[PDB]
Amino acid sequence: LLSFADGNILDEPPSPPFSSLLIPAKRFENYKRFFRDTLTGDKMGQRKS
Amino acid sequence: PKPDTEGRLEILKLHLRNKQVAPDVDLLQLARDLPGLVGADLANIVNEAAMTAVRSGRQQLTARDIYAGVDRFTQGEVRPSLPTAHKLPVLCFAAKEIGIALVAGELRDRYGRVELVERVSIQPKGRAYSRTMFQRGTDEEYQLMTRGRLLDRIRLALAGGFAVRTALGEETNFTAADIKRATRMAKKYVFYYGFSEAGGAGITTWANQPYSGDFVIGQQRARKVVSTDAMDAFADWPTVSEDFRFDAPSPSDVTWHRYTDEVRRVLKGCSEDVLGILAERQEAMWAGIKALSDRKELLGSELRDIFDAHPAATSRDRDARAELAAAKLDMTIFTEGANSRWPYGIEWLDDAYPKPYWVQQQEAEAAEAQ
Amino acid sequence: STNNLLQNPTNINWYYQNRILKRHGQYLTNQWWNGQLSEHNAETVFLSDIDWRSSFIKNDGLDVLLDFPDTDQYYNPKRRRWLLNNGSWNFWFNFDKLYSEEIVTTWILESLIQTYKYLHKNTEL
Amino acid sequence: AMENKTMEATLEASTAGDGGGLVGGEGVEGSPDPIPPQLRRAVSVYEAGKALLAYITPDYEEIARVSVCPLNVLTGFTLFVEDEDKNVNAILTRSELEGRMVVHLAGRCAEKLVMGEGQMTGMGSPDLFHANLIAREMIMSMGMGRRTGPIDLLRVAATSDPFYYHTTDMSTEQARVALAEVVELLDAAEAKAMYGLAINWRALQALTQALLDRGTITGKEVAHILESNGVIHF
Amino acid sequence: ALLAYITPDYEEIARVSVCPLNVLTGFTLFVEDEDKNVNAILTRSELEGRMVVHLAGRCAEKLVMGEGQMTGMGSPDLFHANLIAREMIMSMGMGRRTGPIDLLRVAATSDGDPFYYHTTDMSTEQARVALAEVVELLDAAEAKAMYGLAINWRALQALTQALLDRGTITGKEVAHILESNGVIHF
Amino acid sequence: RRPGSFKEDFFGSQRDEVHEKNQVVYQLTRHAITHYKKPFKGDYSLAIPTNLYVTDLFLKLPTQSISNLTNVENHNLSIKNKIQHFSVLLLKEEKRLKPNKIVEELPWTSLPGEQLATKPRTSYSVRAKVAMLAELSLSNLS
Amino acid sequence: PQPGPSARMAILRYHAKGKPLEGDGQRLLLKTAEATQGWSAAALANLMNEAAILTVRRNVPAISLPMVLELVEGLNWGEQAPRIPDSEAKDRLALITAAKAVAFALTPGLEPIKSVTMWSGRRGLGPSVDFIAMEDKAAMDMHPEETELMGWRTNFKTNAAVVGDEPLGEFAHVAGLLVPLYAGRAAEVALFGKDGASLATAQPLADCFEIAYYCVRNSQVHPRFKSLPPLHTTMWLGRDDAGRWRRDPLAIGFDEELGYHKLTLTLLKASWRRALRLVAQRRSAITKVAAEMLAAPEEKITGARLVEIIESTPLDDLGGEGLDGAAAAAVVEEAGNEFLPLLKEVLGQVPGIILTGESATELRLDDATLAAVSRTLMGRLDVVDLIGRNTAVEAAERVRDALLHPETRERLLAMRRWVEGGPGAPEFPPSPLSPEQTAAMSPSGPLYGNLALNLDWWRRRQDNVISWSAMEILMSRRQVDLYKQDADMTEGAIAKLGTP
Amino acid sequence: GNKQAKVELMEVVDFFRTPEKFKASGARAPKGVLLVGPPGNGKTLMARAVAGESGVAFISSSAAEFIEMYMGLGAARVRDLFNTARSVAPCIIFIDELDAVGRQRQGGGRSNDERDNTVNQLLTEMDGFEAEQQGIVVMGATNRKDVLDAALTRPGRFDRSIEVRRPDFQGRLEASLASLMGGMSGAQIAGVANTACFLTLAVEQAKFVGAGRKKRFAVMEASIALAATLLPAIEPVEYATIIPSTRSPLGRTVLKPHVGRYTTGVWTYRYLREQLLVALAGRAGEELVLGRDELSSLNQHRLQMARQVAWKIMNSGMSSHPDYQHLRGLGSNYFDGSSEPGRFQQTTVVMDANQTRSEAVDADMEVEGLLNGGYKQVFELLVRNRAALDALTELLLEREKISGEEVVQVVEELGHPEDLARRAQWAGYELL
């Protein structure tokens, strides 16, 4: 029952359910674009989108 | 526009224009020590001061009735007092406030940045068991946070827990809140303000700039009082505009280790200074604890008389010197001496990280070429 | 189209249409600024009633728009729990994995061996 | 009634959708109705060890009752009474925390000593996690670590996949040092618990037999049994 | 198409198109029958045959054009063969060294793929053993696909020439070409 | 159930005297360490971590440890979603809410006004999609 | 729906009645129907109306095509916007755009360049390189996916780049895109120095890495990983509700051990050296393009004029110390891009090889035979710097091992002939190392039944000691010995095969 | 004046009253005008002038007044207004604040049903089954270009996208002065004129501090101005002041902006390094003058700016790392559409594929070295120019607003010979 903050941002402020700050979600959308067009892809089996 | 300073003085004089006021009640200090309050609360404060003077069976002399009237609406209601059964709670919730006031007086000496102590209460009045009120200095002293001021604030944070530890001879949970406050203040010291020596000039590659309160949404209505928020949010300039927010890349584990080591160094230095002060003023601390247990509420004036009446015993030489000795902490600073080039005292780093280029430049251009 | 086994031997058109035609056939003339503006920081210049950006600069005339870019965002969600890379691949706390697997496989193998040894003597049945 | 309220509160947190084991005596799948003799012997040994090591620890919460399988629940229950006037609702000392760690490791140490290392059941897991929690709060939160020192490392991020409550962002070397200190505190508490249960073996066995015979027992009978069997105090 | 035709109990080829309307694509379709398998039991021979059929395209590209003339058009087929191999090793317990351990499960998404995979976090030793089994299985599938193309070289030449000449060929015409030019079923 | 450490750490916020804050911290520490398996004080409270461990232990399927893979957060998973939540039917399903998905990118020359006036902003603007997700999340919260 | 092209033609033809159109109105309607894609019927009616509302202040007797295009740009981009004021930074931006345009025109397998401009509309845009569009690909009838067809097409010429009989692979075709993106930085570094590097040429460098990462990892056409067992090292198993991807559980240390990052860095460094060579050799061409763009009526040059400048301007010497600047003289750093010298160097160690070139047995191998075997196995000859010297050496060893066997060599020559085609193609290549005696060894008659065994019986590699690293399991001992200096590991890369 | 909108307004009044040439050329009519631009530039005054020139009536109305709690009342009011317009035959219909009603008819909440009804009524009154036609022009006023409905901004209802903005040099001449008050709208210009009549002090006022904070402001701005003067590629100082504004409570030093750099985006590596120096100059001078223990929170944004410059140097492929020198940034480089058109926000994603674990430490170490070496360089520069720093501090304390010529004079009379020789070597050059 103890996290060690492995692969996330160090100081990430809370999001619209708790706060009204849209900065982490605005960065998360570009993170998802990165996860689309250089790995994973749109569908399973596609090498890059 | 809420009234303040001169307006608060005018409101207090208007509400005290028909009531006799003793000269010991500093109207200017009372106005500066009650920030953000309006006439619709100062009228109640003067009202309760008058009723407390009436119930006391005398005229409106001394500052204790005024302070009780302020406390009745800043820290609402009066809880039952601490029990006289067992010597634990009366000792803890006197030792923490005695140590905070003592460290405040000692930092008022030498440096002078720490404001004077108004009073220490240790009578539970709403949501708390003990208090230490600080005579809020004039504004424009809070519009800017200085390195020495932040160091003094970290010391004043650690003071209560280390005073409880010095009194009991034992670590308690009273250091938990002080550690929680002092770690946040030390992170602001090292990262955001850049007062430390991290990197050799104190400028780290990452800093967590605070955000605005407009993202809070909930905005719990505590109202009035205005605590150390007056020193915290006044010097900090928040973000307010998400379009122009800079957060920097998050630092790696190695540089985060170095930066948190710098934070630990700041905390260790402040903690050792506080422990040295409380070890050298044990007699004054114990006299203040006894006076607090005897008289419950106590003013900062009488505390200054007690601490002057029990000064330090010059040089403790031996036996009493063994309290100053071993009052240093055994906490580990990883990057102290030779561990500040690349391994940083880590035996596994070379088994995980494959020797960065600037590390190789440090070990080749500087080392093995001098 | 939803056939998940179509052959696309090249993806040069994706880069030509998404990184050259969309992006790098053009150039953005908003990269940086002076850093010393008339209203402290660029956020306060932006949230101002005066259009500081448009400024009459004789030193001929005109009102050339001196714009500052938005603050660039850096997302760095990298992994920071690297522990062991020489000899085995291990992150920080995976110490409860070898014992777990060497109990699971051992127990499953022992139970299967017990079942095989029971059913070996009841083949006629 | 107080024991029934506590057991009902735990049962309406450990059956909300599947449950298992904790509510024995049900006549359904993970709940044999005649609690087996080995299981009730283990529960009696666990609760006798906890009661004995709470009795011999000075300045501890005193025992009101000790019950074996309340509400047909496959664990014991010791009713501990606090002194509110002693340390209000705000004061914890290192002696109290270390004694609590010893008492919470006492049950699993007792069942390991009596039933053997391999026959220990999983009823000691919440108490083991509670002792680990006390050690973790002492090292990483209260700043009672010798090497860790006074720094705040835990930043509660429950905010309510693997269910993390605590969450820390410190470096791997500092995490290694802090968790080594937590491990050494747990080792010290376990060593003291085994030392107490070993030096009070006869009193532990008599308390186990008394719990087996009576089911439930009070504080005075616990004190009488331990003082009649020649107990050694800490 | 040749390996799908000679692989037993495989789906019937519907249409083999190589750039049908001057559009840069190529596909080999199969009839989506509602009988037979559906979801009853997946034999390891059936899964190995499917994996060989998936690797057959890149094996044919290697064996005809050379190692350096192969391109990345075989990536979805390589993905499906790798998924079949990993499923056999880590979900069905078909490996002798990993043993019957459930380290991978399939799940259906409630667009992209219609399914995802629940994964168990393995250690380095278990991951290396499972990877050794998967690599052995995939190399064996590549060898079997290469031999299946090797014993049917005249049929492969005829099918390639017919595809080059005609573009789009029905599965009935594919079967006619293979049986006329002589093919050896597995 | 009817619904503080992030406000004072990130947004400044404050507005709590350092005496009542310390009292709250001391009481929370005492409640977390002690008050476990108490008659009425530690009944169901989710502030005691051991109660949460008991619920996880008795209701969840193991725990699963940290993966040794890259481009993943801690386990074999990516980062969480930050913000949590005829022709007529075809159009309604074609543009309804678009929560997860992936936002497309406009060209640097943008699209000529008409084509920008079609293709909803949630599909290309990132800020617009995040604002819509924020508005729905706050509407569900309120 | 929105009006299409024919609907656009009909709507503009109907709404053009009552208005004077200059010259042939059919051409004007054709251009304004090609140039108004996505427009609505009311938008076309407005555009037709607004043209006739004009020609009053300007006093034009008839509506003309340049004014029609002026309103076409206006109603969807707003203000016409002013050109960039003349300055030293403007001259540098012209030089950067000229270098980018020259490297775009010199890139094989690219679409024709329509126009390179210094002056554009809108607010946040400056100089641009516009390529041909649909309305241009129509006239010169061309496949829409001609950019995808540009890889395997041979003996063609686009812009200023020619492609001969050897086609460009997917790897070389996409890796050729790095040079135009690096040319902006290379011009500033070659002409001014390190301190001349600006923020104008910083955006393409950040996409160079993702293009090269696709080239070396995702595309699966890198020559290093073609000889590997058919294992997918770049898998992600699904996306799941709430959109959380799952890495393949076996992929522990895959990217670090297979050297994807170092191979990406090798490709990027080789492309940067190629861009430096390009700016060195075409320095006068880039200066001429910049000057012609700066002295143009609309600060815009055409693609044909850019190609004419590139071909007419002679190739500058890449030597001569600084290339209008200094410290870029490093450009003389040979090249090391051809596979034939490396192959000849490798074959020289084999005794009795007797190499002639374009002319223990003697084995009188020709340059044509070596090139055919190398193109069949390795794939290409001029990508050695892009793929890495270790990859080139491993390929040379494979080509040598194939050349030592006459049957394999003749089969490779025949399949290279079939791939190249032409009148010399001897129909389908021969049997794939399975002769008629081994193919007749197992039809449905004699022997048989070995193909009926399960896949494990085809398991040709079996090791009882599984290594701690995936590179040892994947690659062979020689491959691990040649590679693994590209691996991202600390000291494991001495504990891995070929122990000293 | 009124930007270039006056030609369009002339066209509007011309085809309103005397078509002539438009009827000869075959044009029928504009039927809508959408004035886009910020308020304060006479948006309603231009329509009033158009109505006065055309000789038609004007009725003042806004879209907010149509928002009524009675359902159908706003649509009824719009219909009635257009019916009276058709009765008047002709007039000009003005709808103000269209951004409060006509915005994104997607549904949601119990406040937008009547709003959507009013937008649909406006749509069917501007277009629809031909019931008005004639010489009737409807004008709307918005502050944004395209935030309204697609049908509302469709070029059959509002087919003229006439844009007004803040006045230019000639516009401010019509309504030496325009150099001072250049960059604000006509309403603020009129307010400045009224304040000046009530009293160019009004321009300074439209565009409290004790001794210690004033000294700290003077030291910080003197250090920044001294570094900006001494560093070659940094632009010369325009002015420097320590008087806090209503939103800048630390005093500001403003440099002369570089037109070529701002237009072309050519921000060189040498300029970025010297800008990092200038950003650290305030902290360095404050530390040097007041001692380390008097380091304040005044540089909390200067440190953020210096981190921005260092990370932009790393992300722009200007670092000295061999794997990062002229090849890569920090990776990914995705873009987002900002508020105004033409403005883009850059987001960089760095995930274990664009960077290795040692490369992350290398980048952090390089940024730390850049920041700390820049601080040491600026500290040495201000140490060796201590006399000039002190003279600038006392001049700032005396005057509270100095010009760049005074800064240049103080530096050239009290500067270090090496820094002066470097300045004279790299002078004249407009530095790219």
Side-chain angles (χ1 to χ4, degrees), chain C residues 80-81 83 92-93, chain D residues 170-172 176 179:
Chain C
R80 58 213 289 117
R81 289 314 176 197
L83 201 73
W92 157 222
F93 223 106
Chain D
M170 52 171 175
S171 55
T172 318
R176 196 198 53 82
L179 289 204

Side-chain angles (χ1 to χ4, degrees), chain F residues 121-136:
Chain F
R121 267 166 72 68
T122 321
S123 74
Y124 65 88
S125 185
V126 169
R127 181 184 320 230
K129 147 134 169 191
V130 162
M132 301 326 167
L133 284 169
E135 280 165 2
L136 313 184

Side-chain angles (χ1 to χ4, degrees), chain C residues 18-19 22-24 26-28 75 77 79 82 89-91 93-94 96-97, chain F residues 65-75 79 82 105-109 127:
Chain C
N18 277 287
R19 295 309 189 246
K22 266 188 203 181
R23 263 195 208 176
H24 296 326
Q26 310 288 312
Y27 169 64
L28 292 178
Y75 210 47
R79 284 201 80 167
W82 301 83
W89 285 89
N90 191 81
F91 273 64
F93 223 106
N94 307 328
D96 53 58
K97 246 175 213 191
Chain F
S65 200
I66 294 306
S67 74
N68 306 350
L69 305 135
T70 69
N71 307 97
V72 296
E73 210 205 342
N74 41 6
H75 305 263
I79 316 186
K82 216 67 65 204
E105 43 157 90
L106 270 198
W108 284 4
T109 46
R127 181 184 320 230

Side-chain angles (χ1 to χ4, degrees), chain B residues 91-109:
Chain B
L91 182 80
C92 298
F93 290 106
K96 54 177 305 274
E97 315 296 349
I98 280 312
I100 287 164
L102 205 154
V103 163
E106 252 286 271
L107 295 171
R108 179 70 158 207
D109 308 1

Side-chain angles (χ1 to χ4, degrees), chain B residues 83-357:
Chain B
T84 48
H86 289 276
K87 275 100 69 171
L88 194 57
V90 191
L91 182 80
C92 298
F93 290 106
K96 54 177 305 274
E97 315 296 349
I98 280 312
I100 287 164
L102 205 154
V103 163
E106 252 286 271
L107 295 171
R108 179 70 158 207
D109 308 1
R110 299 196 307 272
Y111 308 135
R113 317 178 188 108
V114 164
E115 48 246 36
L116 299 168
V117 166
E118 208 166 27
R119 64 189 182 276
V120 295
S121 161
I122 78 164
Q123 164 89 38
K125 292 195 227 217
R127 287 271 146 259
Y129 287 151
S130 69
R131 276 156 309 267
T132 203
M133 301 307 209
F134 276 94
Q135 301 211 325
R136 298 201 214 298
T138 79
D139 221 335
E140 171 146 343
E141 279 140 31
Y142 285 81
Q143 233 63 38
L144 169 144
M145 178 73 54
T146 317
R147 164 178 196 277
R149 266 192 50 85
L150 195 38
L151 280 189
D152 292 5
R153 286 297 195 261
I154 292 167
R155 289 182 187 122
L156 274 176
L158 301 156
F162 291 145
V164 168
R165 176 176 130 152
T166 318
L168 271 159
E170 208 192 15
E171 306 115 294
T172 51
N173 75 315
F174 279 80
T175 83
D178 312 357
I179 274 160
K180 188 174 297 311
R181 288 186 52 217
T183 313
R184 170 177 324 131
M185 277 185 276
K187 284 185 162 205
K188 214 148 50 202
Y189 179 93
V190 168
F191 294 103
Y192 187 42
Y193 297 143
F195 294 152
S196 70
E197 291 276 343
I203 314 144
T204 80
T205 80
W206 178 86
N208 210 33
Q209 181 179 9
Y211 285 103
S212 168
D214 310 336
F215 314 106
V216 164
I217 298 179
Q219 306 188 38
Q220 174 198 345
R221 289 324 298 131
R223 302 189 199 273
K224 304 153 274 185
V225 182
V226 187
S227 182
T228 202
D229 186 17
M231 90 161 203
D232 277 313
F234 274 42
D236 279 344
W237 304 329
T239 289
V240 316
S241 177
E242 308 165 304
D243 209 58
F244 287 90
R245 163 70 179 199
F246 184 60
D247 260 346
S250 272
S252 161
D253 206 48
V254 198
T255 81
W256 189 241
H257 164 82
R258 300 198 295 117
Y259 291 161
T260 47
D261 180 276
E262 184 63 42
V263 172
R264 288 170 61 90
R265 179 197 309 268
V266 172
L267 285 183
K268 188 178 184 181
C270 298
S271 309
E272 276 176 346
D273 199 48
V274 160
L275 281 161
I277 290 173
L278 291 163
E280 104 193 308
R281 311 278 267 121
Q282 270 172 346
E283 44 267 28
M285 166 200 118
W286 271 114
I289 282 159
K290 192 204 177 47
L292 261 196
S293 311
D294 280 347
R295 323 175 201 167
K296 261 68 198 167
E297 171 146 31
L298 201 149
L299 281 205
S301 309
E302 321 166 40
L303 259 195
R304 278 194 281 279
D305 321 68
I306 285 156
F307 295 155
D308 279 353
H310 298 267
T314 72
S315 178
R316 289 160 90 104
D317 213 3
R318 57 209 65 193
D319 290 4
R321 190 129 294 279
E323 321 285 350
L324 271 173
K328 324 292 131 45
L329 297 178
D330 303 325
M331 92 187 277
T332 298
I333 307 302
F334 302 87
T335 73
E336 34 178 20
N339 312 319
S340 46
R341 287 296 101 201
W342 154 243
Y344 309 132
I346 299 160
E347 62 179 343
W348 55 262
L349 213 61
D350 280 342
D351 283 290
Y353 284 78
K355 200 78 67 175
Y357 168 78

Side-chain angles (χ1 to χ4, degrees), chain G residues 32 35 37 66 86 89 125 155 157 186 217 295 298 322 344 396 414 423-424 457 498:
Chain G
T32 197
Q37 198 81 6
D86 311 311
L125 294 170
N155 308 296
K157 196 253 218 167
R217 168 160 174 279
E298 218 148 332
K344 285 167 209 277
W457 271 88

Side-chain angles (χ1 to χ4, degrees), chain C residues 5-19:
Chain C
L5 286 142
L6 295 154
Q7 270 63 249
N8 199 359
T10 190
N11 276 326
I12 179 69
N13 214 42
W14 192 93
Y15 277 115
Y16 172 71
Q17 296 248 4
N18 277 287
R19 295 309 189 246

